[PDB]
Design a binder for this molecule. Structure first.
Ligand SMILES: Cc1cc2nc3c(=O)[nH]c(=O)nc-3n(C[C@H](O)[C@H](O)[C@H](O)COP(=O)(O)OP(=O)(O)OC[C@H]3O[C@@H](n4cnc5c(N)ncnc54)[C@H](O)[C@@H]3O)c2cc1C
Length: 257
């Protein structure tokens, strides 16, 4: 420790028995780029117990936010799930990751394709002025299994458009496309199935992906990332990196341990 900032919990919200969000203080020195992750967790017997977490908060916010799984036997989240306001967490000081605008070639459309907690980095990006300066449209796809897992659905649809700074850009440029596999909902099925049938493009009112206009960031389950990568690679889209801008970038929302 002392390669960590101590932050205090300010707010906690449980979406379901497996998903919760919380907000903390943010150190004055803590700088990041929208889409980056850090190591977050708890001081346990005077040593760090930390996991990779996407920063879900805006870089414009005087606070941090995390959108977290709750795993009953998971070493970190078995404890993290019981957090209360005024509890302390630790956050590493060196943000990293691939979900960055400069890893993509300039374009017209940015598709943020997520499952489950993979929404987290995109909650930072849709609350960044810079994404709306760079992209005419931002399409946020969030795929989940149950309606109650659509964390932030009322925030994104109703509260974000009234944001005093970003409200008008979100109204004009953000298209939010939630989908639910295992419960009745206006939009059903896996985002991979919705690309393959063309229903994604019909429903959001934009053309089929093309090499000129469309860029993607992928953050989701190992199955969704493998299937969506193959879809995009076989259509002739290239994976970006710091060393060579591309049309799409990938980050694991988690690893099957
Ligand atoms: C780059 C990166 C970014 C990440 N960002 C986040 C984030 O923003 N929010 C988040 O909750 N986790 C995130 N994770 C996963 C995270 O690092 C931990 O795995 C998670 O905190 C649970 O840790 P644990 O010690 O309780 O259980 P672990 O021992 O890490 O995992 C136990 C099992 O739970 C499942 N699991 C773990 N994380 C998830 C998850 N997010 N969704 C579904 N199943 C999961 C897997 O089946 C895993 O095999 C990220 C991982 C990576 C590699």
């Amino acid at each position: 420790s002392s390669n960590f900032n101590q932050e205090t919990v300010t707010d906690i919200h449980h979406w379901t028995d497996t998903l919760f969000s919380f907000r903390t203080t943010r150190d004055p020195g803590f700088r990041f780029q929208s889409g980056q992750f850090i190591m977050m967790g708890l001081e346990v017997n005077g040593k760090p117990l930390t996991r990779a977490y996407s920063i879900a908060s805006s870089l414009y916010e005087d606070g941090l936010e995390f959108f977290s799984i709750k795993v009953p036997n998971g070493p970190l989240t078995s404890k993290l799930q019981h957090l209360k306001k005024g509890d302390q967490i630790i956050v590493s000081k060196k943000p990293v990751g691939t979900l960055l605008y400069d890893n993509l070639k300039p374009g017209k459309h940015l598709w943020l394709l997520s499952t489950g907690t993979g929404l987290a980095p995109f909650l930072s990006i849709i609350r960044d002025l810079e994404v709306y300066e760079r992209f005419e449209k931002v399409i946020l796809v969030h795929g989940v299994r149950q309606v109650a897992e659509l964390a932030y659905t009322d925030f994104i649809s109703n509260e974000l458009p009234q944001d005093e700074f970003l409200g008008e850009m979100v109204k004009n440029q953000l298209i939010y496309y939630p989908t639910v596999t295992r419960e009745p909902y206006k939009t059903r099925g896996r985002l991979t199935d919705l690309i393959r049938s063309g229903q994604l493009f019909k429903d959001v009112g934009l053309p089929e992906f093309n090499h000129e206009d469309d860029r993607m960031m992928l953050c989701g389950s190992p199955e969704m990332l493998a299937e969506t990568k193959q879809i995009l690679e076989e259509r002739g889209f290239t994976e970006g990196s710091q060393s060579e801008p591309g049309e799409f970038v990938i980050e694991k929302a988690f690893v099957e341990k």
